[PDB]
UniProtKB/Swiss-Prot annotation:
Transmembrane segments: none
Gene (UniProt): RRN7
Physiological role: Component of RNA polymerase I core factor complex (CF) that acts as a SUA7/TFIIB-like factor and plays a key role in multiple steps during transcription initiation such as pre-initiation complex (PIC) assembly and postpolymerase recruitment events in polymerase I (Pol I) transcription. Binds rDNA promoters and plays a role in Pol I recruitment. After binding of UAF (upstream activation factor) to an upstream element of the promoter, CF is recruited in a SPT15/TBP-dependent manner to form a pre-initiation complex.
Species of provenance: Saccharomyces cerevisiae (strain ATCC 204508 / S288c) (Baker's yeast)
Name of the featured protein: RNA polymerase I-specific transcription initiation factor RRN7
Other known facts: Present with 398 molecules/cell in log phase SD medium.
Source lineage: Eukaryota, Fungi, Dikarya, Ascomycota, Saccharomycotina
Quaternary data: Component of the core factor (CF) complex, which consists of RRN6, RRN7 and RRN11. The CF heterotrimer may further dimerize to form a hexamer. RRN7 interacts with RRN6, RRN11, SPT15 and RRN9.
Domain of life the protein comes from: Eukaryota
Location relative to the cell: Nucleus, Nucleolus
DNA sequence: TGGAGTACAAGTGTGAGGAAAAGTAGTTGGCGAGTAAAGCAGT
C-alpha cells in the first residue's frame, strides 16, 4: 500500500473535510453564526427512523474494531 | 553567496497473521417313568 492515498473517492472526502472547517472558522462575514452551529450539531446528533437511517444503523453494527459501534444501547 | 545536512516525504526490501469448513479425534454407550434279561464280578 503506497501511502500517497491515490484513491479518487478517498480524496473527495478530505476536500469535504477541509472546506467545512475553513468556511466556518474564518468567517469575518458573520453569515454563519455560532448559535446556528449550536442548532446544527444539536439537530444532526439526533436519531430518526427513515430507511436510510435504519440502514445506517445496520452499518454501525457490522464493524467491530472501532468505538461508536456499541451504539445500540441508545 | 553558497555549502555541511536534517528533516518529513517520498520510496522498496523482509514473511506472516487470521479465516473456516469438513474431516478427525478420545470419550461413553449400547449391542449382538417301566419289566426285563445275563454278565462277571462277588465269596
Amino acid at each position: 500500500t503506497g501511502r500517497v492515498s491515490n484513491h479518487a473517492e478517498l480524496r473527495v472526502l478530505s476536500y469535504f473535510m477541509l472546506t467545512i472547517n475553513w468556511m466556518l472558522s474564518f468567517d469575518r462575514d458573520r453569515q454563519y453564526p455560532l448559535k446556528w452551529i449550536l442548532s446544527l450539531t444539536e439537530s444532526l446528533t439526533q436519531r430518526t427512523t427513515t430507511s436510510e437511517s435504519i440502514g445506517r444503523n445496520i452499518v454501525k453494527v457490522v464493524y467491530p474494531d472501532k468505538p461508536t459501534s456499541s451504539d445500540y444501547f441508545q
